[PDB]
Design a protein around this nucleic acid. Structure first.
Ligand SMILES: [Zn+2]
Ligand SMILES: [Zn+2]
Lengths: 116, 116
DNA sequence: GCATCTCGCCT
DNA sequence: TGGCGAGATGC
């Protein structure tokens, strides 16, 4: 029930980041424009090389906010994840900073060879 | 812990179908060649128009056995599901037999028109 | 932007 | 008597 903000170390029980994601970060220590900045599913997946199974099966499975696309209401709603959890999930799916670069570098190697 | 086999209506607690799938059917009532017959994920999906999420996300999420492809060890393992559960998961996702048939007919319309 | 849909290899 | 990648378009 009652929880320790990772950040300020204070107790809290109810946070926007603890309701919507299970992130022990009290709303005072929330950074909705910086560390607590969101990302679309797609950018996430292309910017960190993350299978939907890496998001949704891997434990704990990350959660997201639905939003309406801008003046694009005829299209499907955006799945906004917290960028912070993607960063870490990635780090734990790739195991390193270096391995993400290396694999995307190897990824480009094929993309050019796929079409070459 | 204890359960009622849907089929004979007797109490049981342990079953091959109740351990592997959550199917209240005692191993006496078990038809592993017919009603308790299994199908690979691919045929399941292509025979009954199911998305991976219709299998995995839709509560209750269906489970499966892993098996070794015939002399095809070089490849990815088979996920055998139970055919029954898919026949139902399908029915609920498509609502009716009339709505499976229709939708695969409307499917073939576009497959043709996709190439035309 | 995202969730489908076929495809060339089993990293 | 099979499943996983990965590229280009509705939505
Ligand atoms: Zn705090
Ligand atoms: Zn029974």
């Amino acid at each position: 029930d009652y929880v320790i903000c990772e950040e300020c170390g204070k107790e809290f029980m109810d946070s926007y980041l603890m309701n919507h994601f299970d992130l022990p970060t009290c709303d005072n220590c929330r950074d909705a424009d910086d560390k607590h900045k969101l990302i679309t599913k797609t950018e996430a997946k292309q910017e960190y090389l993350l299978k939907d199974c890496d998001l949704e099966k891997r434990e704990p499975p990350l959660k997201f906010i639905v939003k309406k696309n801008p003046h694009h209401s005829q299209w499907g709603d955006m799945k906004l994840y917290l960028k912070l959890q993607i960063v870490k999930r990635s780090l734990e799916v790739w195991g390193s900073q270096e391995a993400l670069e290396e694999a995307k570098e190897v990824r480009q190697e094929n993309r050019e060879k796929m079409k070459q």
